Amino acid sequence: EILMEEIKDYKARLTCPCCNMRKKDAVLTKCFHVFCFECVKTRYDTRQRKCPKCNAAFGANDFHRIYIG
Amino acid sequence: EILMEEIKDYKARLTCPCCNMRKKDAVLTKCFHVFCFECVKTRYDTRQRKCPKCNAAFGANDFHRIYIG
Ligand SMILES: [Zn+2]
Ligand SMILES: [Zn+2]
Ligand SMILES: [Zn+2]
Ligand SMILES: [Zn+2]
């Protein structure tokens, strides 16, 4: 139905595109791309320290939690 | 209806709480609170340079666009 497709699109817009699973709640402050915290933190801890979207490098001070909804 | 209340809640979560009107697309990087760009930029240009949520001061380098959805 039309209402449900709209719900699905909102859910997708709030969902991390990296895992397609957890909600967006983290920002990389070099490039300002948004993901879930777990995806960014696991990349940081494993030394895969590039933005999943645009490949910009980031370090310990370059990602932080945010709260959208 | 139940579907419509869920849509309304998603819309609200993506909407700037300051104007309750435009979509969230800006972050203050001192405190990491999120608003629309126009609300933050108009506060900056008028020298009302405190976070609408938590009152943290911010300057020219402390707010940037982000793209959620
Ligand atoms: Zn993720
Ligand atoms: Zn990036
Ligand atoms: Zn606003
Ligand atoms: Zn704030």
UniProtKB/Swiss-Prot annotation, chains A, B:
Top-level taxon of the source organism: Eukaryota
Subcellular location: Nucleus
Tissues of expression: Expressed in the normal brain and also in malignant gliomas (at protein level).
RING-type zinc finger span: 16-55
Protein family per UniProt: Belongs to the BRE1 family.
Assembly information from the UniProt record: Component of the RNF20/40 complex (also known as BRE1 complex) probably composed of 2 copies of RNF20/BRE1A and 2 copies of RNF40/BRE1B. Interacts with UBE2E1/UBCH6. Interacts with p53/TP53 and WAC. Interacts with PAF1; the interaction mediates the association of the PAF1 and RNF20/40 complexes which is a prerequsite for recruitment of UBE2A/B. Interacts with isoform 1 and isoform 2 of PA2G4. Interacts with FBXL19. (Microbial infection) Interacts with human herpesvirus 8 (KSHV) protein RTA/ORF50; this interaction targets the SMC5-SMC6 complex for proteasomal degradation.
Function, in words: Component of the RNF20/40 E3 ubiquitin-protein ligase complex that mediates monoubiquitination of 'Lys-120' of histone H2B (H2BK120ub1). H2BK120ub1 gives a specific tag for epigenetic transcriptional activation and is also prerequisite for histone H3 'Lys-4' and 'Lys-79' methylation (H3K4me and H3K79me, respectively). It thereby plays a central role inb histone code and gene regulation. The RNF20/40 complex forms a H2B ubiquitin ligase complex in cooperation with the E2 enzyme UBE2A or UBE2B; reports about the cooperation with UBE2E1/UBCH are contradictory. (Microbial infection) Promotes the human herpesvirus 8 (KSHV) lytic cycle by inducing the expression of lytic viral genes including the latency switch gene RTA/ORF50.
Protein name per the record: E3 ubiquitin-protein ligase BRE1A
Species assigned in the record: Homo sapiens
Location of this fragment in the whole protein: 907 to 975 of 975
